[PDB]
């Protein structure tokens, strides 16, 4: 019983809560796609003054 | 007879009625799977605004 107690304790110290991780993964993936789109939008800005000449 | 009565009293004090526990187990498993589906639907919420950009 004491060994099972130490195993449950080590699991309480280290084990991750994966159900949080799935939601944070989905949010971070959507944020990555939005950041790539924002990078393209920022990249377009330089060409607007090409029409000036 | 007095020992039999004391054992019956201890059983009345601590023992559980498992027939209620069976229906509670079925309802709780169904509620757990429904909560997992609700969690997935909550995780999908962020994706809708990618279409706007």
d(CA A5, CA A32) in angstroms, rounded, equals 42
The answer to whether residues B40 and A25 touch, using CB atoms and an 8 Å cutoff, is: no
How far apart, in whole angstroms, are the C-alpha atoms of residue B46 and residue A32? 12
Taking CB atoms and an 8 Å cut-off, how many pairs form between chains A and B?
19
Closest Cβ opposite residue B43 in set A23, A33, A34: A23
Locate B44 and state its tokens.
């999908």
Q: Give A-chain residues touching B50 at CB under 8 angstroms.
A: 30, 33-34
Cα gap B53→B43, rounded to integer Å: 20
Helices (H), chain A: 2-14, 18-44
What sign has the CA pseudo-torsion B30, B32, B35, B40? negative
CA distances from B24 to A2, A21, B32 (A): 31, 29, 12
| Cβ-defined contact of A22 to B42 (cutoff 8 Å) | no
Resolution in angstroms comes to 2.8
Distance of CA B52 to the CA centre of its chain: 41
């Amino acid at each position: 019983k004491l060994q099972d107690s130490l195993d449950a304790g080590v699991g309480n110290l280290v084990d991750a809560d994966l159900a949080k991780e799935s939601a944070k993964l989905q949010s971070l993936q959507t944020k990555q796609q939005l950041g790539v789109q924002a990078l393209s939008i920022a990249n377009q800005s330089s060409s607007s003054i090409l029409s000036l000449f």
